[PDB]
């Protein structure tokens, strides 16, 4: 099945990104796809430490905020914390067992590691703005609106992990387990990986960017500036993360890496399109919870729905999907200052 | 049955280190065991970029070494590369799916990430001292003596991963899989995890230190200074890695974590002892291959064997095991200069 060191001498430049021979030697002198080595290098060059960021005035700014604005700020922060709690562990548990080229294996571990720094930075902000961090952290697990917004993220990863385990343990075929038939299909597993990767692309390229707009709207008012510095560093990493999944996805659909993946991508076009639209819809719906007690200068439900549509169109076009929304200019040009 | 975001609001201070509820929120404001938070902080404080190290003179030094010394140097470097290729991926694929406290989850992902930096450093050295790095990397996979020295490392992680997949898919019990009766015992899986940790302790605390001694024998000669700087950085990280497994193991033994793990540590102590004795013998057996073309002043089979016994006793005492070897003073006190 899976092995931590395949003892067969293989040409790593000829393996597919996924489902080939597990990576044996970790070497970085050559790559099948140099984009992953470039991303590792850039991400290492961007290494930062959350505690090195001064967030000393954020507590008073937060206290002075009108209650509905405290609500907008903390709800957004809790969602960011939820997403990166998932992103810290999931690329490793879900992708590493399936990767067959070294540069992509190490990119995934570097990416996941950088997510743990993001999680540490959210703890740094939370500890410096509320008296008791535990209230904030526990609300993340059970918050109904947060889970509604992130609904389906852990399920894609979880289903891919389960199917990967069946494939590694039993291989392809029609099997039986305790009186039940269990069918294992590599094609279906490739489809699950493709859709999980598309979901991860929507997560980092759309969901987090909507959250960045919220955070930076405060920075525009010269408030929560410690948080702003941290989100700026996080967004700089996120740009690398979404670049990585865009390249994975485009290499999978072009047919240049795995012909079967190309057929899959085509067969999955409609499903993928609607999943992206569903993610956008979940982000829009979050607006009713976010602005339940009123809006803020530079940020309201309508400007956010417009930004969600703007960014979704850009991201979908980048991975070859049709645009679901009417084309428009960036509704919040000021955000470019921060990204 | 594994999930990337467990939906139950649990008190993370009361979960066992392993086999409890998978970690949902990644928070760092509190810890069941602060030693793992301190290790994360120390490892982040040591962050280093391999490519920045000047290895421009190592090529001149290496090409001018007598052939047998080239053999000693490169055989040692190839073994280091093998071990960290395994260490880069294995803590994430084998341990991460079993961790139930956030500070340990993030420590494992940071530890694994730091190992990919070690691998990157071996590529930096190799590509700058030989003309065809591929011959070196391919030999790591096919070299009989290198694989004999490492025998049992990958297979142990692999067996743990397989048993973990059966547990996550089927749960405890006696099952019928393709007409075969398969027993899934959580106690047996705990024993496998426990002994995997003991094996990883021997790997980083003994096997890598014997290799560091070989590398530093060249630094004592005022040669391979780029390599020397890198191995010094690697050893500083390795000290944190073995500290982490010593604490995981000693906390389990104490009975202050999962009580079943304290029972297992006592019941399995002869197996703990046996795996250290076997690893020490593999490290000694390597000397015949390492010095097949001749030895060096101050570095030969006898000296290597004395050091293996010396360091093995120190590491076994640190986790509560009886000493297999006669007591002796350090046979290579010059190594302290470098560590
Ligand atoms: Fe992130
Ligand atoms: Fe990210
Ligand atoms: Fe290492
Ligand atoms: Fe290590
Ligand atoms: Hg994914
Ligand atoms: Hg996913
Ligand atoms: Hg927002
Ligand atoms: Hg927003
Ligand atoms: Hg598609
Ligand atoms: Hg999609
Ligand atoms: Hg809209
Ligand atoms: Hg192990
Ligand atoms: Hg040695
Ligand atoms: Hg033991
Ligand atoms: Hg000896």
Curated annotation (Swiss-Prot), chains A, B:
Active site as annotated: 122
InterPro entries: Ferritin-like_SF (IPR009078), RNR-like (IPR012348), RNR_small (IPR033909), RNR_small_AS (IPR030475), RNR_small_fam (IPR000358)
Enzyme class (EC, first level): oxidoreductase
Gene3D superfamilies tied to this protein: Ribonucleotide Reductase, subunit A
Induction comment: Induced 4.2-fold by hydroxyurea (at protein level).
Cofactor note: Binds 2 iron ions per subunit.
Domain of life: Bacteria
A single MF term (Gene Ontology): ribonucleoside-diphosphate reductase activity, thioredoxin disulfide as acceptor
Listed cofactors: Fe cation
Binding site for Fe cation 1: 84, 115, 118
Pfam families the record matches: Ribonuc_red_sm
Reactions catalysed according to its record: a 2'-deoxyribonucleoside 5'-diphosphate + [thioredoxin]-disulfide + H2O = a ribonucleoside 5'-diphosphate + [thioredoxin]-dithiol
Something else known: E.coli produces two separate class I enzymes. This one is the functional enzyme during growth. A substrate-binding catalytic site, located on R1, is formed only in the presence of the second subunit R2.
Family, similarity comment: Belongs to the ribonucleoside diphosphate reductase small chain family.
PANTHER family reported in the protein's UniProt record: RIBONUCLEOSIDE-DIPHOSPHATE REDUCTASE SMALL CHAIN, RIBONUCLEOSIDE-DIPHOSPHATE REDUCTASE SUBUNIT M2
Function comment: Provides the precursors necessary for DNA synthesis. Catalyzes the biosynthesis of deoxyribonucleotides from the corresponding ribonucleotides. R2 contains the tyrosyl radical required for catalysis.
NCBIfam families tied to this protein: PRK09101.1
Protein name: Ribonucleoside-diphosphate reductase 1 subunit beta
Organism name: Escherichia coli (strain K12)
């Amino acid at each position: 099945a899976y092995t931590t060191f395949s003892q067969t001498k293989n040409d790593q430049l000829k393996e597919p990104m996924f489902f080939g021979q597990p990576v044996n030697v970790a070497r970085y002198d050559q790559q099948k796809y140099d984009i992953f080595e470039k991303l590792i290098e850039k991400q290492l060059s961007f290494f930062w430490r959350p505690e090195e960021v001064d967030v000393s005035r954020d507590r008073i700014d937060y206290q002075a905020l009108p209650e509905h604005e405290k609500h907008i700020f903390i709800s957004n922060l809790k969602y960011q914390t939820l997403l990166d709690s998932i992103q810290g562990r999931s690329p490793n548990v879900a992708l590493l067992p399936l990767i067959s080229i070294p540069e992509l294996e190490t990119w995934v571990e570097t990416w996941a590691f950088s997510e743990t720094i993001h999680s540490r930075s959210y703890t740094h902000i939370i500890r410096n703005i509320v008296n008791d961090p535990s209230v904030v952290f526990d609300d993340i697990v059970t918050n109904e609106q947060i889970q509604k917004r992130a609904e389906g993220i852990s399920s894609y990863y979880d289903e891919l992990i389960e199917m990967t385990s069946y494939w590694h343990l039993l291989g392809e075929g029609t099997h039986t387990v305790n009186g039940k038939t269990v069918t294992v299909s590599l094609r279906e597993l490739k489809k699950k990986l493709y859709l999980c990767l598309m979901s991860v692309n929507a997560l980092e390229a759309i969901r987090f960017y909507v959250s960045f707009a919220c955070s930076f709207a405060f920075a525009e008012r010269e408030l929560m500036e410690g948080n702003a510095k941290i989100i700026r560093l996080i967004a700089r990493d996120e740009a690398l993360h979404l670049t990585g999944t865009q390249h994975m996805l485009n290499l999978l659909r072009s047919g240049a890496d795995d012909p079967e993946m190309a057929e899959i991508a085509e067969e999955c076009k409609q499903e993928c399109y609607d999943l992206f639209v569903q993610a956008a819809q979940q982000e829009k719906d979050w607006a009713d919870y976010l602005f339940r007690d009123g809006s803020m200068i530079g940020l309201n439900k309508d400007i956010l729905c417009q930004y969600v549509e703007y960014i979704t169109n850009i991201r979908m076009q980048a991975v070859g999907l049709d645009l679901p929304f009417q084309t428009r200019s960036n509704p919040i040009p000021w955000i470019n200052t921060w990204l």
